[PDB]
Amino acid sequence: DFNNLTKGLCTINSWHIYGKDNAVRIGEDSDVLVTREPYVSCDPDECRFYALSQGTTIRGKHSNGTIHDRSQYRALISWPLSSPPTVYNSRVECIGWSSTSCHDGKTRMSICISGPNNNASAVIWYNRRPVTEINTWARNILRTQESECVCHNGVCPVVFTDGSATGPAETRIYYFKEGKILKWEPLAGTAKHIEECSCYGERAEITCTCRDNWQGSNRPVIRIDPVAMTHTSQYICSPVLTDNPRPNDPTVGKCNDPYPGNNNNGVKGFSYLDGVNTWLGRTISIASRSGYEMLKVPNALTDDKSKPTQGQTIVLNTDWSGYSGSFMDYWAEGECYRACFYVELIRGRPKEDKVWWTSNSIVSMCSSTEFLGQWDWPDGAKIEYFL
Ligand SMILES: COC(=O)[C@@H]1C[C@H](C(=O)O)N[C@H]1[C@H](CC(C)C)NC(C)=O
Numbered sequence: 001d002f003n004n005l006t007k008g009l010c011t012i013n014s015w016h017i018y019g020k021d022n023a024v025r026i027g028e029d030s031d032v033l034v035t036r037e038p039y040v041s042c043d044p045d046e047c048r049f050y051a052l053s054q055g056t057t058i059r060g061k062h063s064n065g066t067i068h069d070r071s072q073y074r075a076l077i078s079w080p081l082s083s084p085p086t087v088y089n090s091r092v093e094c095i096g097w098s099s100t101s102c103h104d105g106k107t108r109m110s111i112c113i114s115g116p117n118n119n120a121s122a123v124i125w126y127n128r129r130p131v132t133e134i135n136t137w138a139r140n141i142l143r144t145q146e147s148e149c150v151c152h153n154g155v156c157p158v159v160f161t162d163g164s165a166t167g168p169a170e171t172r173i174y175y176f177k178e179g180k181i182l183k184w185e186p187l188a189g190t191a192k193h194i195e196e197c198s199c200y201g202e203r204a205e206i207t208c209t210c211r212d213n214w215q216g217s218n219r220p221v222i223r224i225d226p227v228a229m230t231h232t233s234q235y236i237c238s239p240v241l242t243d244n245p246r247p248n249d250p251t252v253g254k255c256n257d258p259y260p261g262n263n264n265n266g267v268k269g270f271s272y273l274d275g276v277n278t279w280l281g282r283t284i285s286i287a288s289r290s291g292y293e294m295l296k297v298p299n300a301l302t303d304d305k306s307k308p309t310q311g312q313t314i315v316l317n318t319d320w321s322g323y324s325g326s327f328m329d330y331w332a333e334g335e336c337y338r339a340c341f342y343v344e345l346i347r348g349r350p351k352e353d354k355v356w357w358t359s360n361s362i363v364s365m366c367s368s369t370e371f372l373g374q375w376d377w378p379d380g381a382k383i384e385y386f387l
Pocket of ligand 1: 037052069070097098141143146165195213266267268
């Protein structure tokens with residue numbers, strides 16, 4: 001049967017290490033593919049790492065220029081958890097340079113988008129076969145979440161965006177079932193710009209924390225009702241800003257508007273908004289993608305004055321991070337859903353231009369009801385070795 005979001009989130013008192021692939025360190029002397037925009041996603045019988053290959057190995061001569069985001073040599077690949085994305089173990093879900101993927105309890109739906117900027121197209125795969133196609137509607141880089149979608153009784157909402165990344169754009173929430181379109185709605189609510197949403201599901205509701213790439217340093221949020229197939233949007237009210245780059249934390253945040261200070265830029269991120277059991281993720285640095293920390297900010301979503309009450313560093317401010325998204329093992333034993341997340345640890349350009357490539361490795365953590373001691377998890381690769 002299709003999976004149903006019948007549980008609530010487990011109580012988040014800290015974070016335990018879930019998975020790490022040390023891909024760059026290993027790829028230094030093995031056939032590991034160059035990737036970026038990775039995530040984690042589970043099936044009823046296993047969980048896997050996901051990412052957008054660049055169609056070449058790190059050591060390969062074609063790794064030169066992989067700082068680019070959209071080429072005809074990219075594809076959404078998945079591989080064994082904590083293993084590295086190698087040529088020999090990576091499974092291709094579909095061809096394209098923007099994606100999302102999730103299992104509905106019976107089988108898996110995967111979405112890849114490809115094509116020129118003014119004419120991209122999305123192909124929705126289900127049970128590994130192509131089923132539905134959707135052409136651009138704004139003729140400007142049709143794109144998706146870059147992390148797993150979430151399903152409820154067969155219905156799997158997916159947030160897309162087409163248009164300018166630096167101003168008003170055309171965002172849509174598609175409601176799929178068995179890879180077929182049941183309905184779609186244009187974005188509503190007060191979120192003024194949407195991109196790369198990180199979502200999770202609990203108690204028949206789907207929360208997506210996204211990125212306002214044009215004006216908000218606070219992160220927009222879309223909560224979706226998968227049964228009525230309706231949604232609303234707002235901004236995380238809390239003054240604890242979580243995008244990047246971003247201005248310094250104020251004492252009051254903004255609920256229905258973007259907090260200003262930085263324009264046309266950002267990073268994919270996520271949060272878990274569950275009343276007092278709310279945790280936010282953010283790079284430690286306000287100017288670059290360095291370091292990563294989790295911050296317990298009770299009622300962040302609705303309290304425009306909520307400040308940290310607990311925290312945990314995931315990556316030190318002297319190590320590179322990157323995209324970060326949410327996922328959960330909706331098929332684990334237990335009474336509650338265990339909040340998990342991954343952090344893309346970017347290596348190479350533009351920050352490390354001694355090499356001509358841009359890749360990353362993965363770190364993943366899930367929550368614990370215990371108050372576990374913390375440690376930091378850097379990529380671990382030594383750039384000098386690639387010289
Ligand atoms: C797959 O590439 C990404 O995720 C890239 C990565 C890059 C970043 O922020 O690091 N910007 C994304 C770019 C953002 C758009 C809104 C301009 N998306 C696409 C599909 O080109």
